[PDB]
Each structure stands twice: as C-alpha cells, then as structure tokens.
Amino acid sequence: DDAAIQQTLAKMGIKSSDIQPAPVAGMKTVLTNSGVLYITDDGKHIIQGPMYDVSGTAPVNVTNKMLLKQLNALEKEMIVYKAPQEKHVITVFTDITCGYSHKLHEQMADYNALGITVRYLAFPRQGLDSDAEKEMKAIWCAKDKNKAFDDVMAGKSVAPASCDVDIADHYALGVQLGVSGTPAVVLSNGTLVPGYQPPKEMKEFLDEHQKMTSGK
Template identity: 40%
Template sequence: MNKLALTLAGLGLIATSSMSANAAEQDYEQIRQQFRQVNLTVNAVAEAPMDGLLQVFTNRGLFFSSKDGRYFIEGNIYDLNNKVLLNDAQMRPYIQQNVAASKDGTIEYKAKDEKYVINVFTDPSCGYCRKLHSEIKDYNNAGITVRYMAFPRGGLGSETYLQMQHIWCSKDSRAAMDEAKDGDDIAPAMCTNPVKAQFEMGQSFGINGTPAIIMPSGRLIPGYQPAKALLAQLQAE
C-alpha cells in the first residue's frame, strides 16, 4: 500500500480494503494536480462522510472536493441529523496525530498535578498570547500542562519568525520564552529548530491567528481562554 494510504489508515480515515492502492494513488494524484492550480498543497485525501465527495487535507486546512477535483467547497459543512460540524469532526484525528508527533519540539510548562495537556500555537508579539502566558500558573494550578508551538503571525522571514528561532535554540528555552512574552530582547541563538515546521503545521490546521489552543481531543479553540473556562471545557470533553 502506498504511503498516503497507510497514513490515512493510521488516522482511521479510510478502510484499507475499500480500494486498491494503485487506484487510490491515481485518483488522488488528479486531486493534487487540480488543487495546485489554486496554490494548495494536498497532504492527504479520504472519502468524505457525504456521498460523492472527498475530504482533502491541505497546507491551508480542510476542504471538500468532487471526486474529479473540479469543484471544491471552502466553508463549514454541518450534519444536521447528528448536529455535528463535519469540518471539526474530520480534522480532529488529523490534528491529534500531527501534534503528538511534534511533542519533542514544544516548550512545555508542566503542571505538578497534571490532569490535561493542551498545545498552544503562540507568537510572543501577540497581546492575548502574552495575557495567556501571564496566567500560566493558573493553568498549571488547575492541572493543565501547556505546550507551546510556534506560529509567527508575520510568516516565515518575519522578525518574529527569527525571534522564535532564537527562543527555541536558547539553552533555556522556557526562560527565553518568558523574556519574550515580557517584551524583552532575546539573545541570538541558532540551531536546527522546529519553528518553520510548526508554523506550516498550524496553517494546515486552518490556523491564521494566535493564540490557538489544541485540546486533547484534537479540537481547535481559536483565541484566549482563561484557565477556569478552559478547565470546564476540558472536563466536558
């Protein structure tokens, strides 16, 4: 079976017996070519919950497409029978797997009595990111471990992108993050780092601003949440 089919099977998005690997590869190559016309890179493709459509995971989030790739849908699709936002439901396993694979590249603020782990795409220049960070003890005291992932809002090559590389490459990346969130300058430090990969990952989730909170379920919450409100949501999942 090809690499794409194996990836999708691991996500639970397709049944490996539903089609031959060669047929899937041929069909999906056509989809990839069609999406390139609108500057979208296809990361994965699977049958959608709606008959006649595919769900296409791209470098800019999830889209739904006709089988030949001629038409695609940008926007939310609801399952009224089950009262479910399909975009969110289909993205969750994709987000979970990608975030789990990036655990070692995060900057972690661990709760002493850990009950939950959230991943937060952050930018030190973002006001609400700074507000969230100023309350990091509140999250930890509530049993919430916070793992930061990089999302420089100015994009690759921006001043913040360079700053975030310095943070991740510092000998003490947590101290560097604290300083950056306080508005202090960060001493230059360069190394092999995950900033670019994490930024591109966030874009593939459909993230376009910070903070963006990834719940353990894979649910994405855009924007700041105080510890008490976030804890209530975690408990309800």
C-alpha cells in the same frame, strides 16, 4: 487518484497539504491553503464543505476532525509545560511579541499549579519572515524548547538553529482553525477560544466547559 486531484488544484493556484480518503465513496478530504476541500476521485468536482457525519446522535464535523489530525502531527513540535497533576490540556497559539502572551507565560506556574498543562505552537501575528517568526523559529529549533522559550521571554538570547521545524505549518494550521490574535486557546475537541484568561478564570472556564461538554 491523488494524481489528477493535484493537477486540478495546480490549475487553480491551490496547494494541497494532506489528502485523506473521505467518509464518502469516491471522495477525498483535502487540506489546502483555501481550507478543507472535498474533491472527487477524478478531481473533477470540488465541494466547499465542511462535511458532517449526520448518521448518529449529533452531527460530527468532518472538517474539524481533519484539522485535529494535523494538530496531532504537531504534538511533537509543541512546547509542553505540564501540570504536576494534569487536569486539563490546552494548546495555545502564542506570539513572543504579544504582551498578553508575555503575561500568560509569566503565569505559567499558576496555570500548572491549577492542573493546566499548556502546549505552545507558534503564531506570528505579523506573518512569516517577521522578526517574531524568526525568533520563535530559533526557539522551536533549540535542544530544550521549554528552556529556550523561557530565556527569550526573560529577555535572554537563545542559541538559534537550523532544524526541521517550520513555523509556517503552525501558522497555517492556526489560520485554518480560526486564529487571528494571540494568545488563542484550542481545546481538545478543536474548540477555539481567542484571548488570554488569568489562571483562576482559565481553570474555572475549563472546568465549566468540561462539565457542559460531558453533561455534568
């Protein structure tokens, strides 16, 4: 009953973003500004979470899964810098006002040459309505996102816009994911790795991570 669930969140100053049926009967996985909450059908009880599916080899984090669902819907708004021969794919929360994000982009060619595809999402450290947020908003709204981003990091102005992209979505998901500084790397499985890493170290890091992750 999405209805009663919302009245409850309302009577608490909590806004819902995505409500999906939870792995447990009578409960729904709710994404809110207060984190992922598990609420009963009648909206009478709220369990903090996270939720783990322990019916198996190792625990499956239901909250992580839900946040990756949101990540999936944002793929259409990510600025993708693909590697000729894609070995790894990482999602980076970046701020065009962050010196380390500058460096990262300035090395985008090396990251790609090493098989690393970088997918950007905006994350204005100074929050919404900040100069950074207002400039990225223009970048993510341009025709060619890759080109617009390149120009701004180059210093060149970009042809602004009024599109359907809302940085707040990126920002809120980043926060939800544990982001706080930039750049922040998010891995395929949802693992967050704050900080900038030079190409060689990044490649080395991702290779080792994939080995450990797959037991090799």
